[PDB]
């Protein structure tokens, strides 16, 4: 509806939560070519050694990849100097992070939503090495980044971590998108109720949609 004299302005908003899924590593396969090619034979090995450094460099190549799967998982998760933690009391202005903060009742350190993320993804000189960081050492870094985020905004990225009340960090957020912070405070119960409603739809969408992690299942 364009003209030289008409403008449209937001009268109301939704906070919305969206899910973005990225692969970060491949399964760390490693191979012994000699056992693959020449399984149980020194006569075959005496022939294969005539081909020289093709035997070695296949394994150097897969070593470079295998070591790099841990260099990836460090740069993606281990960005924070310290394991930050939330207080036991949840005075986050009405914003109910209980579905995405860690559950201490369960054996691995993951949240309610991360436990859906583990449910929705699945002999011959060939081998699969382990990751350097266990799934619960990843869940400790996602908890540290998330606990730093809820309690201290960007400030724990910039240097030492500085606490701030959560609904006042959201005033910094709304000013970062040109909405002045009186719009947050004049709607804080609505904003928290929309956010809590949205997170509840992330549980139901991931619970019902068995294919949701297609970007990871295909890797």
């Amino acid at each position: 509806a364009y003209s030289n004299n008409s403008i449209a302005i937001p009268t109301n908003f939704t906070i919305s939560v969206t899910t973005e899924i990225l692969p970060v590593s491949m399964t760390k396969t490693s191979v012994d070519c000699t056992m693959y090619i020449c399984g149980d034979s020194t006569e075959c090995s005496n022939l294969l050694l005539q081909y020289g450094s093709f035997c070695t460099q296949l394994n150097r190549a897969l070593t470079g990849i295998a070591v790099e799967q841990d260099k990836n998982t460090q740069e993606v998760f281990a960005q924070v100097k310290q394991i930050y933690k939330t207080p036991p009391i949840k005075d986050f202005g009405g914003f109910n992070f209980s579905q995405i903060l860690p559950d201490p009742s369960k054996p691995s350190k993951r949240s309610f939503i991360e436990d859906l993320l583990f449910n929705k993804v699945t002999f011959n000189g060939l081998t699969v090495l382990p990751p350097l960081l266990t799934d619960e050492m990843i869940a400790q870094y996602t908890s540290a980044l998330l606990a730093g985020t809820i309690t201290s905004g960007w400030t724990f990225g910039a240097g030492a971590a500085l606490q701030i009340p959560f609904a006042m960090q959201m005033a910094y957020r709304f000013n970062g998108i040109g909405v002045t912070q009186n719009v947050l405070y004049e709607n804080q119960k609505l904003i928290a109720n929309q956010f809590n409603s949205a997170i509840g739809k992330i549980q139901d969408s991931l619970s019902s949609t068995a294919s949701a992690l297609g970007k990871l299942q295909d890797v």
Binding site: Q50, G52, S53, G159, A160, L162, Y172, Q181, K189
Partner: protein, 196 residues
Amino acid sequence: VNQNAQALNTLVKQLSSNFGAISSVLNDILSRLDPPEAEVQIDRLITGRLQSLQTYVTQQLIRAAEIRASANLAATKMSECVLGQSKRVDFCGKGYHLMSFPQSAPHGVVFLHVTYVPAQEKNFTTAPAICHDGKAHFPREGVFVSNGTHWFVTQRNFYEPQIITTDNTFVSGNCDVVIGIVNNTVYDPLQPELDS
């Protein structure tokens, strides 16, 4: 520099390998076997040597699509962060970014990022808004802090407190609406100047 020396040394070393032939030395197939037999041996050294290069070249190509991604990221850092200032977090060192100076190194770039890091710090009590005449006041270029006995407003990234005024604040609505609003007094510098 190691990998681009090691793949060369690996590819030189594959000249000594026999590949199932009588020998790896080319004159010593020829000066030993007659051409009908020497061609069946040299077809082995050619198939070996050639599979050597095709694997070496596949590695230098996959490696080049890695140094390329590094050089695009070095170009993007030099653009956004030598030639500019970046608001991207952790993209140009741990800090808030001021500037950077690029230095040359053999086969590489060496930025000196210069970053402002928040150092020494103090706790404060704080308020989302303040009352004064039933109207609710919010900061303009900072946040409200109590030192323990006096309310102030300060810039979010460096403690430098100032008297709460209608120059340092703006208004909306009333104190019924804002959760956690505090009662305090706002100075107006117009009033001494209207009394004078």
